[PDB]
């Protein structure tokens, strides 16, 4: 007896770590699913994932490592990078710590170097390649938060997943804020207070939910 294929799922509020058969180390963020084989095929090292993970890929220049998501294939020979691709999110991002990374989509193929990032907007189809501190992007590894012109909906999803908390918007209020912020491991209430400071977004408890709102 022996398993050939495994699926690891991460709940909201938690983290998981996996060493793959090739020696690649994966850090899986809250709400992530990853399918991987107990032995890789001879031609590539393929994994399937939905959510967010940080990969530390074992260099093998004759056997590419592929992170397959619904929207893209992230291919390396070696390196370390973050893939953020939650099904519920409007954005997708691939950020490189070390190594060279190819992000392959039907409409674009881009090769990224350390501290380069690709942001794909699943709504309007806009793609952006820019420079970004990969250490800040991977702040979730140490339970931190990093927002750089991040839409409020992505901020809410990040908070819901990190703290395993339902966060709901007040239907009377308009929310189209872009958040800027950097938080060390803090409580949800400390982060919501920091967001209140820079946006005026207030929060209230309604049973098991947190309701966000604004007022004049
Ligand atoms: Cl490397």
């Amino acid at each position: 007896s022996d398993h050939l294929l495994t699926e690891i799922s991460v709940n909201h509020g938690e983290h998981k770590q996996v060493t793959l058969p090739d020696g690649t180390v994966v850090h899986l963020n809250a709400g992530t699913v990853m399918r991987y084989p107990t032995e890789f095929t001879s031609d590539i090292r393929l994994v399937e994932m939905e959510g967010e993970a940080f990969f530390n890929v074992m260099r093998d220049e004759g056997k590419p490592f592929i992170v397959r998501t619904r929207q893209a294939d992230v291919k390396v020979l070696g390196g370390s990078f973050n893939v953020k691709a939650y099904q519920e999110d409007e954005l997708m991002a691939v950020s490189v710590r070390t190594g060279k990374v190819e992000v392959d989509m039907p409409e674009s193929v881009m090769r990224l170097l350390p501290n380069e990032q690709i942001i794909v907007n699943n709504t309007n189809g806009e793609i952006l390649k820019k420079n970004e501190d990969a250490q800040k992007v991977t702040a979730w590894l140490q339970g931190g938060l990093y927002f750089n012109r991040t839409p409020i909906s992505s901020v809410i999803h990040d908070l819901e997943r990190m703290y395993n908390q339902e966060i709901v918007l007040d239907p009377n209020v308009v929310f189209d804020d872009y958040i800027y912020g950097e938080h060390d491991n803090k409580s949800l209430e400390a982060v919501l207070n920091a967001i209140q400071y820079s946006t005026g977004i207030r929060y209230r408890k309604e049973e098991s939910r947190i309701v966000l709102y604004k007022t004049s």
Side-chain angles (χ1 to χ4, degrees), residues 1-69 71-86 88-216:
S1 183
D2 196 58
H3 313 299
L4 308 174
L5 189 63
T6 312
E7 191 173 85
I8 181 164
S9 11
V10 189
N11 292 324
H12 294 172
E14 62 181 41
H15 285 8
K16 282 173 179 188
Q17 205 193 70
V18 182
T19 296
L20 298 178
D22 67 331
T24 293
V25 178
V26 192
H27 289 84
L28 305 123
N29 201 4
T32 304
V33 188
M34 189 184 61
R35 272 180 181 179
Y36 65 92
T38 61
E39 190 178 335
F40 288 116
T41 79
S42 56
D43 297 345
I44 60 155
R45 298 169 285 164
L46 182 69
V47 300
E48 289 177 314
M49 81 106 143
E50 182 275 300
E52 175 164 44
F54 179 80
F55 296 85
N56 193 331
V57 177
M58 185 64 39
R59 179 157 301 276
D60 186 346
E61 287 184 313
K63 196 177 186 191
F65 188 99
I66 299 175
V67 178
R68 172 159 298 146
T69 71
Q71 324 93 311
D73 281 14
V74 183
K75 322 168 186 289
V76 302
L77 295 183
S80 63
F81 55 99
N82 195 80
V83 185
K84 186 183 192 179
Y86 290 98
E88 57 267 39
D89 287 8
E90 61 172 284
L91 299 172
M92 197 226 63
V94 183
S95 315
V96 181
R97 179 82 194 99
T98 69
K100 196 180 184 165
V101 175
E102 181 186 285
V103 174
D104 179 7
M105 286 165 280
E107 64 278 9
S108 61
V109 189
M110 298 194 7
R111 286 97 184 178
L112 308 171
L113 294 176
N115 295 308
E116 291 180 344
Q117 161 179 258
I118 189 181
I119 307 165
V120 180
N121 190 309
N122 303 321
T123 310
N124 52 38
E126 295 191 357
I127 302 162
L128 174 70
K129 171 206 180 168
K130 59 175 276 183
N131 300 291
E132 184 56 278
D133 187 352
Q135 289 180 263
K136 287 179 186 168
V137 167
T138 60
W140 63 266
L141 294 169
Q142 306 82 35
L145 297 158
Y146 174 67
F147 312 126
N148 180 23
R149 201 176 181 269
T150 304
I152 189 60
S153 58
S154 294
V155 170
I156 294 159
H157 293 157
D158 282 350
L159 299 184
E160 291 187 284
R161 290 188 294 252
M162 175 172 286
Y163 300 97
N164 188 28
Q165 175 63 61
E166 195 187 348
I167 304 167
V168 164
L169 295 179
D170 190 323
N172 296 35
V173 178
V174 172
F175 289 96
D176 204 37
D177 306 76
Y178 290 98
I179 313 298
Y180 293 81
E182 196 176 358
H183 310 281
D184 281 322
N185 185 57
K186 289 171 172 65
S187 70
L188 176 53
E189 298 75 28
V191 175
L192 284 175
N193 290 333
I195 288 167
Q196 189 176 330
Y197 178 74
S198 65
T199 67
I201 298 167
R202 300 170 107 233
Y203 60 98
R204 57 179 204 261
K205 181 183 170 293
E206 279 188 13
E207 297 177 305
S208 59
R209 289 159 288 119
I210 285 167
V211 179
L212 305 184
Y213 66 101
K214 295 172 183 176
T215 185
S216 296

PDB file of all heavy atoms in Angstrom, residues 59 79 98-99, ligand 1:
ATOM      1  N   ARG A  59      16.433  23.583  -7.138  1.00  0.00           N
ATOM      2  CA  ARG A  59      16.933  23.751  -8.497  1.00  0.00           C
ATOM      3  C   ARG A  59      17.159  22.399  -9.162  1.00  0.00           C
ATOM      4  O   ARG A  59      17.800  21.526  -8.593  1.00  0.00           O
ATOM      5  CB  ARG A  59      18.235  24.577  -8.506  1.00  0.00           C
ATOM      6  CG  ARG A  59      18.855  24.777  -9.913  1.00  0.00           C
ATOM      7  CD  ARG A  59      19.771  25.993  -9.998  1.00  0.00           C
ATOM      8  NE  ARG A  59      19.098  27.253  -9.657  1.00  0.00           N
ATOM      9  CZ  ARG A  59      18.384  27.988 -10.506  1.00  0.00           C
ATOM     10  NH1 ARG A  59      18.235  27.602 -11.768  1.00  0.00           N
ATOM     11  NH2 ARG A  59      17.810  29.113 -10.099  1.00  0.00           N
ATOM     12  N   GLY A  79      14.271  28.556  -7.579  1.00  0.00           N
ATOM     13  CA  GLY A  79      13.930  29.866  -7.062  1.00  0.00           C
ATOM     14  C   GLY A  79      12.895  29.788  -5.968  1.00  0.00           C
ATOM     15  O   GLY A  79      12.473  28.706  -5.575  1.00  0.00           O
ATOM     16  N   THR A  98      13.637  34.975  -5.061  1.00  0.00           N
ATOM     17  CA  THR A  98      14.909  34.557  -5.661  1.00  0.00           C
ATOM     18  C   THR A  98      14.600  33.800  -6.947  1.00  0.00           C
ATOM     19  O   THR A  98      13.477  33.318  -7.100  1.00  0.00           O
ATOM     20  CB  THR A  98      15.769  33.685  -4.676  1.00  0.00           C
ATOM     21  OG1 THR A  98      15.138  32.430  -4.473  1.00  0.00           O
ATOM     22  CG2 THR A  98      16.003  34.337  -3.327  1.00  0.00           C
ATOM     23  N   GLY A  99      15.596  33.659  -7.824  1.00  0.00           N
ATOM     24  CA  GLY A  99      15.454  32.929  -9.084  1.00  0.00           C
ATOM     25  C   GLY A  99      14.763  33.681 -10.211  1.00  0.00           C
ATOM     26  O   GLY A  99      14.578  34.892 -10.123  1.00  0.00           O
TER      27      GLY A  99
HETATM   28 CL1  LIG B   1      17.910  30.303  -6.534  1.00  0.00          CL
END
